[PDB]
Design an enzyme around this catalytic site. Structure first.
Site, short mmCIF file in Angstrom:
data_model
loop_
_atom_site.label_atom_id
_atom_site.label_comp_id
_atom_site.label_asym_id
_atom_site.label_seq_id
_atom_site.Cartn_x
_atom_site.Cartn_y
_atom_site.Cartn_z
CG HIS A 148 77.34 29.55 41.41
ND1 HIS A 148 78.21 29.23 40.40
CD2 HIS A 148 76.94 30.83 41.20
CE1 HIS A 148 78.34 30.27 39.60
NE2 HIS A 148 77.57 31.26 40.07
N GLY B 85 78.68 38.82 38.82
CA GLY B 85 77.36 39.16 38.27
C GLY B 85 77.16 38.64 36.85
CB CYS C 242 77.62 33.48 37.12
SG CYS C 242 79.39 33.19 37.40
C1 LIG Z 1 79.61 33.60 39.15
C2 LIG Z 1 79.31 35.03 39.49
O1 LIG Z 1 79.00 35.85 38.64
N1 LIG Z 1 79.44 35.28 40.81
C3 LIG Z 1 78.88 36.31 41.59
C4 LIG Z 1 77.57 36.75 41.44
C5 LIG Z 1 77.10 37.76 42.26
C6 LIG Z 1 77.91 38.33 43.23
C7 LIG Z 1 79.21 37.87 43.37
N2 LIG Z 1 80.07 38.44 44.36
C8 LIG Z 1 79.99 39.86 44.74
C9 LIG Z 1 81.25 40.09 45.55
C10 LIG Z 1 81.63 38.71 46.05
C11 LIG Z 1 81.05 37.77 45.03
O2 LIG Z 1 81.40 36.62 44.80
C12 LIG Z 1 79.71 36.86 42.56
#
Ligand SMILES: *CC(=O)Nc1cccc(N2CCCC2=O)c1
Ligand SMILES: *CC(=O)Nc1cccc(N2CCCC2=O)c1
Lengths: 304, 304
Positions: free
Chosen positions: B41, B143, B145
């Protein structure tokens, strides 16, 4: 989302752990630059520990009696001195993995990570608090002495704790890295009892903020209180008096949540008076007091 | 003495964490040999996450669109492939800090350490369990993930988890390092609810052994029970059925303490039926189920 009892990454400290042997005693040392720090009781037999005279015991020790091993490589000891309750072993080689570091003496209520080691080898990492009675509630077996407590600010490790001893009640006492014990404890096997383990009120309130931020809100109520009113209830439950300083420290969490510190105090008051009623807050059935307001902001904002 | 929720030292894993950026998405990757592993993703906009077709989304991505940064140094991507729900980014440089490693798919009830990272930088380390509903109770922000879960056996890191997603109930889902989700979870922003969070009976019993070993004994009683009798009480309280396999696994702790597993089951039965009565066990007001029998033996014996 989610809130966990979280240690600092241990890598920078792993790189500093060595084995120190003096006679039949093996424990851990901290290798920073060309100095290895270890508890002075490395020189004691268990018999010595009853009434040790460290200056006298130390006279019988030479540099070559301090066996210092980093992994499988021996370090040459070229000097040794006693500073309070630690030994500083000067080695001929600077630890190539020395991180940026400070020695800091922490206050009760302040939290830190412990890297539990045996024979200079890391076993695990957990989060602690310097208790108001100057004990910590650790996990330490024979051989774990010289394990250190630390905080990290970006790239700089602040060492605050070296593990020295267990009280017969299963709680832990140690020194800062200048070798001064936290609280009244001595490196002697004697009658030492911990005082009242009071709860760190400001940390409980921080953790109640962390709960609200992470969706646990059932304990928010319609009440407020005053520092003086709250502190009557604090006294009764062996909680630290809440100060305006503590209120000011919680300001950012107050601002972020829109819950006035005194309103959160009123929640904490009802929790003390009425219990959890078999409910949980951030997966705990008691009021957690080993997260500082700084810890809550760090974890809730994702600081690295 | 003392028993703490203890993570593995994170150093070996810190050395493997990198930043992966694809378009406006930055998360973490695991760099082992010349391969960086990250959640597929990374290629999605938040809009994509509603109903992503990963094969189709991936066609618009080239090697040069995967920005891989280890500290402040960029890695050259020379290949990319999708394996289940992970991307494997082939880089031109083997991670010089690659530890000995395995990829293992863990069972529910098994525990592991998470190194929470943001932008390829470690923030902290905490201990988790794969819940019987195949969720974990983590601490993960946007962030985080690509943060991984691991066990260490001496010098070999067994990676068991990569963090992929948060359920609207604040619990966490992810994959093994072959990119297969634990449980029924999908990397889509959809209606996914966790099943019953059952308590890991064998872990609670392990932890009751750890308590006895560390001086907490008030809950030992005069009673015994049978697997079948205990399991009636387990059913009622949403505890996993206790198996002879679980009994056999607790044998060493039984032997060490001299408390028959079924006698400890009878203690656990009274605790379920009667509550703690406002008492604590190893500083907890509820029954802890995120220590395995292996964890208890490791910590109680000082394995490094
Ligand atoms: C899974 C994870 O960590 N998701 C992720 C990574 C980087 C940025 C996001 N954002 C920032 C604001 C909206 C969003 O989903 C999410
Ligand atoms: C403080 C500490 O870790 N003490 C310590 C180090 C090495 C060996 C011991 N033992 C072994 C058995 C008796 C004893 O005190 C203790």
């Amino acid at each position: 989302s989610g809130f966990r009892k979280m240690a600092f990454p241990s890598g920078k400290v792993e790189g500093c752990m060595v084995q120190v042997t003096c006679g039949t005693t093996t424990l851990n040392g901290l290798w920073l630059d060309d100095v290895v720090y270890c508890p002075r009781h490395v020189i004691c037999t268990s018999e010595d520990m009853l009434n040790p005279n460290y200056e006298d015991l130390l006279i019988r020790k030479s540099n070559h009696n301090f066996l210092v091993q980093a992994g499988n490589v021996q370090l040459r000891v070229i000097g040794h001195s006693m500073q309070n309750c630690v030994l500083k072993l000067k080695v001929d080689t600077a630890n190539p993995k020395t991180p940026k570091y400070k020695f800091v003496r922490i206050q009760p209520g302040q939290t830190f990570s412990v890297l539990a080691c045996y024979n200079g080898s890391p076993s695990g990492v957990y989060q602690c608090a310097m208790r108001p009675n100057f004990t910590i509630k650790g996990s330490f077996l024979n051989g774990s002495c010289g394990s250190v407590g630390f905080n990290i600010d970006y790239d700089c490790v602040s060492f605050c704790y070296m593990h020295h001893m267990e009280l017969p009640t299963g709680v832990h006492a140690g020194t800062d890295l200048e070798g001064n014990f936290y609280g009244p404890f001595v490196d002697r096997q004697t009658a030492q009892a911990a005082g009242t383990d009071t709860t760190i009120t400001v940390n409980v309130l921080a953790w109640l903020y962390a709960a609200v931020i992470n969706g646990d809100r059932w304990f928010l109520n319609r009440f407020t209180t005053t520092l003086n009113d709250f502190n009557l209830v604090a006294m009764k439950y062996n909680y630290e008096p809440l100060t305006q300083d503590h209120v000011d420290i919680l300001g950012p969490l107050s601002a972020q949540t829109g819950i006035a510190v005194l309103d959160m105090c009123a929640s904490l008051k009802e929790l003390l008076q009425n219990g959890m009623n078999g409910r949980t807050i951030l997966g705990s059935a008691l009021l957690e007091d080993e997260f500082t307001p700084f810890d809550v902001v760090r974890q809730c904002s994702g600081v690295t």
